[PDB]
Design a protein around this motif. Structure first.
Motif, PDB file in Angstrom:
ATOM      1  N   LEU A 163      22.257  49.129  63.879  1.00 49.84           N
ATOM      2  CA  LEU A 163      21.804  47.847  63.337  1.00 49.84           C
ATOM      3  C   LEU A 163      21.500  47.945  61.846  1.00 49.84           C
ATOM      4  CD1 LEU A 163      19.401  45.548  65.341  1.00 49.84           C
ATOM      5  CD2 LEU A 163      19.003  45.820  62.887  1.00 49.84           C
TER       6      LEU A 163
ATOM      7  N   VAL B 265      24.993  47.680  59.853  1.00 52.25           N
ATOM      8  CA  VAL B 265      25.493  46.313  59.840  1.00 52.25           C
ATOM      9  C   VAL B 265      24.659  45.473  58.866  1.00 52.25           C
ATOM     10  CG1 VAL B 265      26.028  44.321  61.307  1.00 52.25           C
ATOM     11  CG2 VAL B 265      26.351  46.575  62.191  1.00 52.25           C
TER      12      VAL B 265
ATOM     13  N   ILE C 122      30.572  44.629  63.668  1.00 53.48           N
ATOM     14  CA  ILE C 122      30.200  43.270  64.076  1.00 53.48           C
ATOM     15  C   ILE C 122      30.628  43.021  65.531  1.00 53.48           C
ATOM     16  CG2 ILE C 122      30.589  40.785  63.674  1.00 53.48           C
ATOM     17  CD1 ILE C 122      28.939  42.039  61.528  1.00 53.48           C
ATOM     18  N   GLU C 123      31.830  43.487  65.909  1.00 47.47           N
ATOM     19  CA  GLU C 123      32.310  43.318  67.276  1.00 47.47           C
ATOM     20  C   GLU C 123      31.397  44.007  68.281  1.00 47.47           C
ATOM     21  OE1 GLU C 123      36.315  44.133  68.373  1.00 47.47           O
ATOM     22  OE2 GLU C 123      37.198  43.276  66.558  1.00 47.47           O
TER      23      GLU C 123
ATOM     24  N   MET D  29      28.350  45.003  67.882  1.00 46.98           N
ATOM     25  CA  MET D  29      27.063  44.335  67.832  1.00 46.98           C
ATOM     26  C   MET D  29      27.117  43.111  68.757  1.00 46.98           C
ATOM     27  SD  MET D  29      25.317  41.577  66.286  1.00 46.98           S
ATOM     28  CE  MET D  29      26.242  41.061  64.838  1.00 46.98           C
ATOM     29  N   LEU D  30      28.153  42.284  68.605  1.00 48.27           N
ATOM     30  CA  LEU D  30      28.348  41.089  69.435  1.00 48.27           C
ATOM     31  C   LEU D  30      28.566  41.400  70.914  1.00 48.27           C
ATOM     32  CD1 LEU D  30      30.719  38.982  67.091  1.00 48.27           C
ATOM     33  CD2 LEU D  30      28.325  38.433  67.605  1.00 48.27           C
ATOM     34  N   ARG D  31      29.111  42.578  71.218  1.00 54.17           N
ATOM     35  CA  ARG D  31      29.304  43.000  72.606  1.00 54.17           C
ATOM     36  C   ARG D  31      27.963  43.328  73.245  1.00 54.17           C
ATOM     37  NH1 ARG D  31      33.503  47.855  72.769  1.00 54.17           N
ATOM     38  NH2 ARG D  31      32.589  48.176  70.686  1.00 54.17           N
ATOM     39  N   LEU D  32      27.137  44.083  72.523  1.00 51.90           N
ATOM     40  CA  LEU D  32      25.810  44.461  73.003  1.00 51.90           C
ATOM     41  C   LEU D  32      24.765  43.403  72.629  1.00 51.90           C
ATOM     42  CD1 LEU D  32      25.802  47.371  74.540  1.00 51.90           C
ATOM     43  CD2 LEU D  32      27.534  47.341  72.689  1.00 51.90           C
ATOM     44  N   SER D  33      25.237  42.182  72.389  1.00 51.20           N
ATOM     45  CA  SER D  33      24.383  41.042  72.080  1.00 51.20           C
ATOM     46  C   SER D  33      24.611  40.042  73.208  1.00 51.20           C
ATOM     47  CB  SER D  33      24.760  40.434  70.725  1.00 51.20           C
ATOM     48  OG  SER D  33      23.815  39.476  70.293  1.00 51.20           O
ATOM     49  N   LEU D  34      25.414  40.472  74.177  1.00 57.70           N
ATOM     50  CA  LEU D  34      25.743  39.689  75.354  1.00 57.70           C
ATOM     51  C   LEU D  34      26.046  40.660  76.497  1.00 57.70           C
TER      52      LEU D  34
ATOM     53  N   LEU E 166      36.131  39.869  73.792  1.00 57.83           N
ATOM     54  CA  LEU E 166      35.299  38.801  73.234  1.00 57.83           C
ATOM     55  C   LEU E 166      35.875  37.405  73.407  1.00 57.83           C
ATOM     56  CD1 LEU E 166      33.833  40.423  69.997  1.00 57.83           C
ATOM     57  CD2 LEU E 166      32.533  39.475  71.899  1.00 57.83           C
TER      58      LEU E 166
ATOM     59  N   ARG F  97      32.397  32.122  79.291  1.00 54.59           N
ATOM     60  CA  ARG F  97      31.139  31.418  79.055  1.00 54.59           C
ATOM     61  C   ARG F  97      31.307  29.997  78.470  1.00 54.59           C
ATOM     62  NH1 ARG F  97      26.134  34.853  76.446  1.00 54.59           N
ATOM     63  NH2 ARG F  97      27.372  36.468  77.510  1.00 54.59           N
TER      64      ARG F  97
ATOM     65  N   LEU G  22      21.481  40.056  65.484  1.00 50.85           N
ATOM     66  CA  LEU G  22      20.793  41.345  65.352  1.00 50.85           C
ATOM     67  C   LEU G  22      19.417  41.310  66.021  1.00 50.85           C
ATOM     68  CD1 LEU G  22      21.462  42.304  61.564  1.00 50.85           C
ATOM     69  CD2 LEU G  22      22.672  43.247  63.525  1.00 50.85           C
TER      70      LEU G  22
ATOM     71  N   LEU H 136      18.856  39.589  68.915  1.00 50.11           N
ATOM     72  CA  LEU H 136      19.204  39.746  70.322  1.00 50.11           C
ATOM     73  C   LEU H 136      19.431  41.212  70.672  1.00 50.11           C
ATOM     74  CD1 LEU H 136      19.661  36.560  70.093  1.00 50.11           C
ATOM     75  CD2 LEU H 136      21.862  36.929  71.239  1.00 50.11           C
ATOM     76  N   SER H 137      20.187  41.903  69.824  1.00 55.26           N
ATOM     77  CA  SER H 137      20.531  43.306  70.032  1.00 55.26           C
ATOM     78  C   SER H 137      19.389  44.318  69.854  1.00 55.26           C
ATOM     79  CB  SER H 137      21.691  43.689  69.111  1.00 55.26           C
ATOM     80  OG  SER H 137      22.815  42.852  69.330  1.00 55.26           O
TER      81      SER H 137
END
Ligand code: ANP
Ligand code: ANP
Ligand code: MG
Ligand code: MG
Ligand code: MG
Ligand code: MG
Lengths: 578, 575
Positions: free
Chosen positions: A542, A545, A568-569, A571-576, B519, B526, B569, B571-572
């Protein structure tokens, strides 16, 4: 456009004469110029004049000059390949009788298409010069009047500095129509505003007023009278006279490159008249004249009304003033006062530096600026956040010349300039604020040490707690003498269009100071999860990024968009879950 | 006084510069004689006569050239060049007669000077004699053996007779010079080393030329010429073996301004003016033949040397050539070299690309970038590379323009991968499979077009060009790409200005998506669950804003992009 000119100029039908008088005066300028280095160049015809006859019996109009004239070889080129063709707007057939010093007298005839040149069977009638004879057409067959020519000359001969005579009744004899005296020689108290405007149009056309004009006479080391003008628009120039005699308009070193847009006349009674062009150009008195022209140009620019300067002058010639600050070391202070820039004080209005200064805080001694590629970029920048909040005005530089312009100006009215994207930004600090800060710096030390020693190792110069951020989590600050984001950009564009890949320079490929906001929620969380587990990769991933987005936010190019994107990808994967 | 003991090496070069000067003076009076019959009045001859004198310790270099007037003697003589005469002497006496003035004598003791009328009067008729009162430490130059080899050493390409005072055991002048020009000799007989020595005689460059060509032109006009390619980024015109000029700036097209050489024609007018002769009809026929023979020369260069050496130096000239020269465009297109995905560094010719093309491939694909690395890691080339298609990479500003001036190469059209129009053939089983997945993702296609990215995209479609990348921004055929957005907008910002309302700068692009990408699959998954969800709203914009940078465009608002990133960031980490 052969016959597609007659209808497009059916308005200006009478200008045919102006165009011929203009040509005559030019021919008179040339031969007079030759005679300055040749004592017997006027031997064929002693006088320098414009003579106009109406031959109503034969349907002919004669415009006779005693100028340079044209040779056999010059008749086939100059009269063929506005202007001279303006005569065809009032004439079906055009014949010119001409006599040059280096050839016999010839007659040139043309209907509009083909041509032929014959030697004049009369011999040499003029001695020197040219007679434009127009076989005047039916509707134009009214110019051959004892008052039509009389009145047209008296309005289109304005600013012609050679005597113009017309064959008139009174006995048939020549009658002087114009005044030979130059308007730049007349005192200012007598010259009307309309006359100055009409003069501007007479040597540059465009049929619109100049933005400004100055009419002065110089005393001291050199004496000369002059009239200078600022055009209304940036075109996308200065006539030199010696003792009322035209010399040249091909001297480009008259004005410095930044004032290249200025038009006008200089009439010097101190310069050598009876000399060549090469000798006069390198004459010591010219450099004296030049320095005076620049100062009087700046006087003129300064005199422009406040609103007009910003709304009209600045828009066209602001860049020239900016180049002036860089070039003109002796006029730098005068030029710095003419500068205008955008600032946070208003969404669009531009400001002078004196106005910025008056708005400054009592203990503020730096003029702050943010340099960007657009206003929007510069104003939404992380570096102006606190300054703006606390009420410091920030100048926004949106053109590439701006930074070299500021970089060429060490101080303005005792104040030094500071780039907000660089080290050296200061806030006056109460003892309460100062101590509250020192506590924060120590509280965040385990995050600063972590970022510098592992998470962002070999990426940043150092990690510190910022004092310039409001909303932004972090930013990248360049060293005081290093390159900013805007400089990196400007240089990379220059190194691509011209340069030979300056990648491993000195202060181009160098790390910056990574400044963090201790009040930003994400940095607060980041301090927490680091002290618990230092090797927590989720925080380390984090940080990278966040650093890379700060790169973009700070105005710096990203070193690898592929990787950034791939982060970014993840991050977005582990953000969902994706 | 800092040249006497340094110019070291080249210490005996005083004669080369004096021979050179004499030859220039001879060239100049002969040039005047073409229009003026009364020019060669004082002397019929055009020679250089060097004379030794042991007793008086004098060395005379006499020419029957133009000469110098009193006014010229004061200006021209003084502060390579004429000064080199002070390396072997400490007093130079210059006797000079010009047609427009009486004869004068100029003398200088390296510091000061004087110019008075010659007591003897007119003895030269026309020309100059340079007397050197040599130093007694370097007076070896007055020896017959020494002078005879020294004049031959520096008059190889001097086209006027050079004589020396000598005798046979009867004192008279002797010829140490063959005035037949190197270009007028048969091509076979001229040795390679002679062409090299000729190149350094007028370029004064020391090193060899990269290439040269010596030809006789035939047909519409006849001339003889020797042209040269230098090793690092002027044409002499002669008519009937008589030097005319080297100030005709348009002898070669601007793109070939590096070519140096000579042109000698017997078909051009001699006794005419420079102005007149510059616009003569035959000169343009000569101009066209020079280009073609120059290109013939550039083509004769061996393969490795061409890419390694010529291309590194003059590659940009060839690209400008394709743009400037419509007549030789096809010849020039074959000289172009570019980097491509075939090799990490090697450059390739277009013919080489064509020979590697697939059976039913009709287009030459190109990716344009600010560097190789951005070009090769573009989303645009992902599937083309995977399927075996080669992509040329254009890393220079001129490249875009160069290719644009080339409507085709060998029957093939160029295709910008950043633009709509990339082709992939398919069978009925693949075409219907595409049409099935396309209709499967269509809810997402309309959601991105009407909800998520409503006024930011032209249309959202399913891509056939991505492999690893989730999405990419594709430009219209009549629109601007990322690289051209730069080239244009980094000149509207640099020079232009007020180009916010440009032709097509604020134009929306085609947003292509990768159906096989995690993605994009989970976004489709979703998008049917809630749709009103702000998480997928953010996901799609963040992905669109990352696709932009990734596509060569610029981010509208960087701040808003940053704000999005950090909410993700949040959320993560805290969740
Ligand atoms: N009275 C004249 N005497 C000698 N030469 C002339 C005369 N009139 C015209 N010429 C020649 O014709 C040329 C073209 O004249 P013209 O078409 O009026 O253009 P110009 O005067 O050169 N420039 P402009 O002021 O824009 O018209 C000039 O350059 C002259 O060489
Ligand atoms: N033998 C000569 N006859 C006539 N003019 C001469 C002679 N030698 C020298 N000059 C003049 O002296 C000037 C200076 O000569 P020099 O210093 O050799 O430079 P350059 O000949 O102009 N060019 P370069 O010799 O290539 O450096 C020349 O421009 C000539 O006009
Ligand atoms: Mg005119
Ligand atoms: Mg990936
Ligand atoms: Mg020389
Ligand atoms: Mg925020």
């Amino acid at each position: 456009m052969m016959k597609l000119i007659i209808n497009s100029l059916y308005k200006n039908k009478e200008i045919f004469l102006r165009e011929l008088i203009s040509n005559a005066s030019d021919a008179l300028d040339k031969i007079r110029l030759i005679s300055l280095t040749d004592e017997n160049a006027l031997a064929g015809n002693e006088e320098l004049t414009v003579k106009i006859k109406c031959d109503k019996e034969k349907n002919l109009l004669h415009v006779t000059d005693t100028g340079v004239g044209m040779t056999r070889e010059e008749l086939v080129k100059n009269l063929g390949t506005v202007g001279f063709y303006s005569a065809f707007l009032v004439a079906d057939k055009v014949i010119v009788t001409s006599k040059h010093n280096n050839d016999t007298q010839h007659i040139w005839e043309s209907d509009s298409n083909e041509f032929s040149v014959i030697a004049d069977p009369r011999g040499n009638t003029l001695g020197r010069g040219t007679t434009i004879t127009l076989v005047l057409k039916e509707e134009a067959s009214d110019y051959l009047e004892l008052d039509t020519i009389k009145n047209l000359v008296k309005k289109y001969s304005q600013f012609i500095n050679f005597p113009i005579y017309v064959w008139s009744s009174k006995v048939w004899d020549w009658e002087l129509m114009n005044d030979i005296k130059p308007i730049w020689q007349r005192p200012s108290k007598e010259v009307e505003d309309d006359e100055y405007k009409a003069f501007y149009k007479s040597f540059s056309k465009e049929s619109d007023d100049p933005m400004a004009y100055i009419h002065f006479t110089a005393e001291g080391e050199v004496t000369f009278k002059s009239i200078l003008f600022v055009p209304t628009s940036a075109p996308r120039y200065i006539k030199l006279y010696v003792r009322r005699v035209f010399i040249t308009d091909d001297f480009h070193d008259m004005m410095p490159k930044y004032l290249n847009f200025v038009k006008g006349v200089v009439d010097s009674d101190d310069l050598p008249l009876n000399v060549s062009r090469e000798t006069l150009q390198q004459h010591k008195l010219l450099k004296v004249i030049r320095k005076k022209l620049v100062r009087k140009t700046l006087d003129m620019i300064k005199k422009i009304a406040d609103e007009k300067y910003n709304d009209t002058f600045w828009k066209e010639f602001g860049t020239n003033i900016k180049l002036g600050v860089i070039e003109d070391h002796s006029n730098r202070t005068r030029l710095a006062k003419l500068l205008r820039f955008q600032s946070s004080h208003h969404p669009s209005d531009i400001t002078s530096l004196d106005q910025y200064v008056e708005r400054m805080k009592e203990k503020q001694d730096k003029i702050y600026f943010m340099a960007g590629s657009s206003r929007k970029e510069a104003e939404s920048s992380p570096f102006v956040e606190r300054l703006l909040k606390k009420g410091y005005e920030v100048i926004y530089l949106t053109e590439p010349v701006d930074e070299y312009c500021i970089q060429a100006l060490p101080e303005f009215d005792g104040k030094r300039f500071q780039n907000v994207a660089k080290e050296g930004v200061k806030f006056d600090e109460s003892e309460k604020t100062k101590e509250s800060r020192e506590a924060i710096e120590k509280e965040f030390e385990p995050l600063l040490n972590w970022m510098k020693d592992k998470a962002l190792k070999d990426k940043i110069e150092k990690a510190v707690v910022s004092q310039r951020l409001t909303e932004s989590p972090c930013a990248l600050v360049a060293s005081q003498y290093g390159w900013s984001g805007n400089m990196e950009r400007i240089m990379k564009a220059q190194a691509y269009q011209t340069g030979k890949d300056i990648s491993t320079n000195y202060y181009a490929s160098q790390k910056k100071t990574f400044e963090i906001n201790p009040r930003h929620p994400l940095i607060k969380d980041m301090l927490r999860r680091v002290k618990e587990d230092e090797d927590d990769k989720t925080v380390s991933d984090l940080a990278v990024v966040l650093f890379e987005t700060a790169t973009l936010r700070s105005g710096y190019l990203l070193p690898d968009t592929k990787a950034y994107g791939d982060r970014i990808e993840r991050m977005l994967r582990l953000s969902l879950n994706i």
